[PDB]
Amino acid sequence: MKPEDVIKEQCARAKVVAELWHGFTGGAPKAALENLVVEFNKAQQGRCVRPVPQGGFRDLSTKIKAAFAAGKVPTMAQAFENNIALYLEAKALLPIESLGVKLQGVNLTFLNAVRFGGVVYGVPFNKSIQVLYYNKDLLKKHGVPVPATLEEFVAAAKKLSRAEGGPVYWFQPDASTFAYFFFNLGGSYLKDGKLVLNSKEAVEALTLLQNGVKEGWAKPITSGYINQNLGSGPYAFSVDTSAGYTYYLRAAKFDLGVATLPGRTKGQPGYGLVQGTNLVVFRQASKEEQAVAKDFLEFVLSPRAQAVFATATGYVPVTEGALKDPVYQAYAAENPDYATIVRQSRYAKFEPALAEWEQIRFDILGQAIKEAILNKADPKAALDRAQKLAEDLLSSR
Numbered sequence: 095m096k097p098e099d100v101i102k103e104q105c106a107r108a109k110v111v112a113e114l115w116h117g118f119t120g121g122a123p124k125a126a127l128e129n130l131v132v133e134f135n136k137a138q139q140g141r142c143v144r145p146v147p148q149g150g151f152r153d154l155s156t157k158i159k160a161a162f163a164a165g166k167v168p169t170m171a172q173a174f175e176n177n178i179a180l181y182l183e184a185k186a187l188l189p190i191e192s193l194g195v196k197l198q199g200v201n202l203t204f205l206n207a208v209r210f211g212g213v214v215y216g217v218p219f220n221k222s223i224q225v226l227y228y229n230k231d232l233l234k235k236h237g238v239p240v241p242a243t244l245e246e247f248v249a250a251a252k253k254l255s256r257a258e259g260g261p262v263y264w265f266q267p268d269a270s271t272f273a274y275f276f277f278n279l280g281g282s283y284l285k286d287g288k289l290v291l292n293s294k295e296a297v298e299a300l301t302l303l304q305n306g307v308k309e310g311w312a313k314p315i316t317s318g319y320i321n322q323n324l325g326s327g328p329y330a331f332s333v334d335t336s337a338g339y340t341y342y343l344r345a346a347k348f349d350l351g352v353a354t355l356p357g358r359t360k361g362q363p364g365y366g367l368v369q370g371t372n373l374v375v376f377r378q379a380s381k382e383e384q385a386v387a388k389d390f391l392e393f394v395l396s397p398r399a400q401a402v403f404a405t406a407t408g409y410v411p412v413t414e415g416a417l418k419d420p421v422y423q424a425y426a427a428e429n430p431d432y433a434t435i436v437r438q439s440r441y442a443k444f445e446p447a448l449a450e451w452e453q454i455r456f457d458i459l460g461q462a463i464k465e466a467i468l469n470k471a472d473p474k475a476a477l478d479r480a481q482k483l484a485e486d487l488l489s490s491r
């Protein structure tokens with residue numbers, strides 16, 4: 095039986111059912127969430143959670159806005175920080191601490207990100223960090239150390255591309271990959287409270303990617319995830335979410351490595367972009383559904399739930415107690431990549447938490463990155479257009 099069939103039967107027999115809308119489309123993340131819910135539902139007498147897949151994360155936020163418009167919302171949903179900011183304009187969210195959920199021990203990197211006007215409105219659940227995936231076999235073949243600095247990284251990609259006859263640094267031309275390069279060239283998105291997409295560091299980061307394509311060391315991936323394109327052409331490296339860990343492990347026909355990100359200098363790893371989502375609880379839920387949500391959120395933050403979830407997926411454990419749990423410890427003792435993901439989670443940056451950020455990161459900035467990389471648009475001209483389109487949107491609403 096599929097975990098979802100088990101959940102269907104649990105919920106059919108329950109007196110109260112709290113809907114949880116999510117953007118996991120399959121693989122380990124969907125299975126780990128479903129397994130967690132099956133175990134929680136077994137503990138409860140006539141009280142259950144029903145996970146409902148809404149497609150991916152942007153399908154989820156579109157369907158959540160339409161749910162408001164149709165007058166009928168789930169009890170819980172996954173949300174990015176910028177989605178929480180949007181739902182707060184409508185005052186749609188219950189303060190988490192009012193519900194009774196204890197948040198002491200939640201990483202302050204994650205807890206700070208869910209706190210708005212001093213109030214926590216999300217529970218960090220599935221938080222990822224960017225890591226360096228590499229081909230251990232291909233680096234060994236050419237005597238190339240794992241690069242520790244941006245300078246070393248560019249040098250390695252050129253040395254390995256020339257030897258193997260193809261570009262070996264694989265990337266999606268998207269806001270997530272852009273953020274890695276932007277952040278570690280000294281970039282910041284807010285200057286004196288204003289959103290700035292066309293700063294010198296943004297032009298420098300996009301120009302670096304464009305030059306990498308022209309010089310033959312950077313390969314744009316335009317169809318599917320990087321881990322869905324492995325096997326065609328030489329691969330050395332990618333900068334990608336920790337949540338891609340199980341997908342790379344199943345796809346790679348080589349010895350997969352995971353390292354901390356190249357930084358400006360060897361004094362510190364590079365900053366990784368934090369992705370994945372928080373759980374939120376909707377005000378429109380009944381008292382009884384909100385009690386299920388409270389018990390569910392406390393279960394999700396328990397050291398065992400966090401240990402099983404993060405080791406099944408490559409998401410970062412969100413509590414200090416998860417790291418003390420023997421299941422976590424047994425996994426980490428067999429697999430150094432779990433400690434590498436935790437160490438990289440210490441060097442973590444977020445994108446702006448503006449209500450408009452979902453639309454800006456995909457339709458405005460994402461599109462300028464694609465114009466520059468796929469159609470050789472001038473990076474400054476592409477980003478100047480992105481700045482005007484973003485200013486017009488913010489001024490709009």
Ligand SMILES: Nc1nc2c(ncn2[C@@H]2O[C@H](COP(=O)(O)O[C@H]3[C@@H](O)[C@H](n4ccc(=O)[nH]c4=O)O[C@@H]3CO)[C@H]3CC(O)(O)C[C@H]32)c(=O)[nH]1
Nearest residue numbers: 118123151152174176222270319335337338341369370452
């Ligand atoms: N809607 C909305 N999206 C946002 C926002 N900020 C960032 N992002 C998106 O979050 C994804 C990162 O989230 P994360 O939980 O770390 O990783 C996801 C998947 O990315 C990754 N995955 C899935 C299948 C696969 O074959 N390989 C694989 O790696 O696994 C996880 C669960 O599906 C990025 C990826 C994107 O969806 O393509 C665009 C980015 C925002 O503000 N709004």
